[PDB]
Amino acid sequence: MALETWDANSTPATLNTAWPEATDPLNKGDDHIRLLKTVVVNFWNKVFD
């Protein structure tokens, strides 16, 4: 639940929709935003280039 195992080239494939669970910790909040940012940038780079 905490976070999808991830790295700079994770892409939209590594996204678990259910992962930010209700009782899950706040300290993991920053990470979830960043996973989303990396994913969006790579997708844009892939299909606009």
């Binding site: 999808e4 195992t5 494939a13 590594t14 678990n16 669970e21 209700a22 009782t23």
Partner: protein
């Protein structure tokens, strides 16, 4: 080598056990599929009925003194209406009920009379006149959180006496004769103690509504029984099954002389003799980890009359308006659990449906592409009722249909299993998981009964600590071919099937693989 996992072993949705070890025929996620002895088939859709109250709805009850007297009640907010035939009529008290009602309307048949309590205004009964009127011989201020009946006595729970609320109950009434409202509330004279009873416990006496023959009273945190003994003390009280409470006033139902109850900590079935914790290693954790709980009062339990099933409607975390977006379906003929992902819903109840004008070749207005079934629906099962559903954004009430088209729009289904068992095979012929070597997958072969096409996703993870990563395998059209080819190496594998089609029955599947070294991280 090949491994063949066969469905129709009746294991079902098991989201609490470790995915790596759940047996074939078990899945870890997915919705809109239910397990049968045929495989993993897809559930049907919804049609529309003629009933439409055009008020806020939020509650529907059925009244029918005799055959053909199909009367539908829709208790909304500040207005209670009656729907009969093609007309809707008001039946509310002269003083419309206070705001917030409709979240709390309860109804019960007391030897032929209908009583409704909103807890925010005085209890009411439907009078002979045809208007709900307030209670006949009881003082105005007293309020009961819920209204129940035990033989000839109408009971009340969580009673306020004009001073405050006490969370205790009154044996209201003095034995009303059948067809009549109770004589009086007088806990001091004729019925002697006609109430005022403590029932001590840490909880608040939620619903005592159900009867096994002896009323069972459910308090939060405990179960108690009730029996009619008469004399100076009218009723007797014992504490049966301490520690097992009840979640909500709408989370109880009876079947075959037993009760299905959603307790705050468990789901259980009981008969007074003993208890049994259904849902313990399957679905207990998932239900309480996917419920919001801001709303816990919005859950309810319904029983399907046509087929043996129990429906547990509840809100999800993803719900934004607080309504109900999901359901846990239990089959008691054969113990399996299912999950349904459906549009926001207010309330549901079952009742008889009136007929319709005969459809003839001359009067039909659509091309072959239009919806319908050969039998006009009412004619189907004229012997039994049909569930009716109030859906919030839909103008008219709905009913289930074998056809899967919703009103016209399509329903998607997801079938997902995580960490399939790929490894050695026991001499008995059963496979078991191998956690120490990498594996390489060549093909997946499906045994299905449907003819329409579907999508298949393949997931791979290096080891247990990692997360699943998904790849699109392709689209499978069974008539053309039933095999799919992909080359992957990973520690563990998972598969997901998504279909939007009228029919989808899955019987089995097999995987061809080879061992590819050792697992590191």
């Amino acid at each position: 080598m090949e491994v063949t996992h066969k469905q129709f072993d009746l294991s079902g949705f098991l989201p609490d056990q470790a995915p790596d070890t759940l047996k074939s025929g078990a899945i870890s996620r997915g919705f809109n599929v239910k397990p049968t002895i045929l495989g993993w088939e897809k559930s049907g859709g919804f049609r529309e009925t003629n009933t439409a109250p055009t008020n806020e709805k939020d509650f529907i009850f059925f009244w029918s003194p005799a055959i053909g007297d199909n009367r539908w009640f829709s208790g909304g907010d500040k207005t209670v209406q009656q729907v009969e035939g093609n007309v809707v009529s008001d039946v509310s008290r002269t003083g419309g009920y206070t705001a917030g009602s409709g979240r709390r309307w309860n109804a019960v048949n007391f030897n032929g009379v209908l009583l409704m309590n909103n807890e925010l205004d005085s209890p009411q009964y439907l009078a002979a006149s045809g208007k709900l009127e307030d209670f006949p011989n009881l003082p105005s201020n007293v309020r009961f959180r819920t209204v129940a009946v035990y033989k000839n006595f109408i009971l009340g729970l969580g009673v306020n006496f004009g001073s405050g609320f006490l969370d205790d109950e009154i044996y209201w009434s003095h034995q009303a004769d059948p067809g009549t409202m109770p004589p009086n509330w007088d806990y001091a004279n004729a019925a002697s103690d006609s109430g005022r009873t403590p029932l001590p416990s840490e909880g608040y006496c939620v619903t005592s509504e159900e009867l096994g023959s002896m009323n069972i009273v459910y308090k939060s945190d405990s179960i108690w029984t009730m029996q009619l003994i008469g004399g100076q003390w009218i009723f007797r009280f014992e504490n049966k099954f301490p520690g097992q409470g009840i979640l909500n006033k709408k989370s109880v139902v009876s079947f075959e002389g037993k009760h299905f109850v959603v307790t705050q900590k468990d789901i259980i079935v009981h008969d007074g003799y003993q208890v049994r914790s259904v849902a313990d290693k399957r679905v207990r954790n998932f239900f309480f980890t996917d419920m919001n709980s801001d709303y816990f009062e919005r859950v309810f339990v319904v029983k399907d009359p046509r087929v043996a099933e129990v429906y547990v409607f509840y809100p999800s975390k993803n719900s934004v308006d607080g309504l109900c977006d999901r359901a846990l379906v239990w089959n008691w003929r054969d113990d399996v659990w299912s999950l349904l992902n459906l549009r926001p819903l207010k309330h549901a109840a079952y009742g008889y449906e009136i007929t319709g004008v005969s459809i003839t070749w001359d009067n039909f207005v659509g091309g072959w592409e239009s919806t319908g079934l050969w039998q006009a629906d009412e004619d189907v099962a004229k012997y039994a009722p049909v569930l009716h559903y109030s859906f919030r954004d839909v103008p008219k009430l709905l009913a289930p249909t074998p056809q899967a088209l919703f009103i016209d729009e399509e329903i998607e289904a997801v079938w997902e299993r995580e960490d399939i068992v790929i490894g050695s095979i026991s001499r008995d012929g059963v496979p078991y998981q191998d956690y120490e070597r990498n594996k390489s997958v060549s093909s997946i072969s499906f045994d299905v009964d449907t003819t329409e096409p579907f999508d298949v996703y393949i997931g791979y993870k290096g080891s247990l600590e990692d997360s699943v990563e998904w790849e699109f395998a392709g689209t499978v059209n069974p008539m053309e071919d039933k095999r799919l080819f992909c080359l992957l190496t990973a520690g563990l594998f998972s598969m997901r099937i998504i279909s939007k089609a009228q029919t989808f029955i899955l019987r089995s599947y097999k995987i061809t693989y080879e061992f590819a070294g050792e697992m590191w991280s």
